[PDB]
Design a protein around this ligand. Structure first.
Ligand SMILES: Nc1ncnc2c1ncn2[C@@H]1O[C@H](COP(=O)(O)O)[C@@H](O)[C@H]1O
Length: 165
């Protein structure tokens, strides 16, 4: 039982909240799709994006640079399915809105709808770090959209406590 390794709370038959590292959660599930909380240029310099890139030994960034050079930058709310690099079956790069730039927070709906294409998704709370969206607000957008099995992973115990009462 992969989740026995982690404190967690089942919210619905779709959505479970997990305390830990989303990369280590996804490693337990060979058929999971791991969500990267990315920016429009897929520049994975810090945050969960930097951690995912480091776990891939830089391979994620090389793949992202090829994609962006070929396709041009993404829009806020866009998502792109790329290779998993042995971290997960695939990695879904999702561009959440940046509240610092007063971008439309409701674009999180579009971000989370994109996860419904996959039978099992491991995701952080998109935009919930430096992009300035409060975790409970990002969770609100997630639970409204999720139609598949989603493990929502938070690496702060204070965030986990606040989300589980
Ligand atoms: N490995 C991780 N696993 C789960 N959550 C993370 C991880 N790294 C960062 N976070 C949090 O997930 C949210 C989105 O990450 P970020 O896009 O980097 O702001 C923020 O609340 C981060 O603090």
């Amino acid at each position: 039982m992969p989740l026995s390794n982690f404190e967690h709370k089942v919210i619905t038959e779709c959505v479970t909240i997990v305390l830990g590292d989303a990369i280590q959660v996804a490693k337990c599930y060979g058929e999971s799709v791991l969500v990267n909380a990315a920016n429009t240029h897929l520049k994975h310099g810090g945050g969960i994006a930097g951690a995912i890139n480091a776990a891939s030994k830089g391979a994620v960034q090389k793949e992202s640079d090829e994609y962006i050079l070929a396709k041009g930058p993404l829009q806020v709310g866009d998502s792109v399915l790329l290779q998993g690099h042995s971290l997960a079956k695939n990695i879904l790069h999702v561009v959440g809105p940046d509240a610092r730039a007063k971008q439309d927070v409701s674009l999180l709906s579009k971000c989370y709808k994109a996860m419904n294409a996959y039978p099992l998704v491991v995701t952080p709370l998109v935009s919930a770090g430096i992009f300035g969206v409060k975790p409970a607000v990002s969770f609100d957008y997630l639970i409204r959209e999720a139609k598949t099995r989603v493990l929502v992973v938070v690496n702060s115990q204070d965030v986990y406590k606040s989300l589980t009462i």
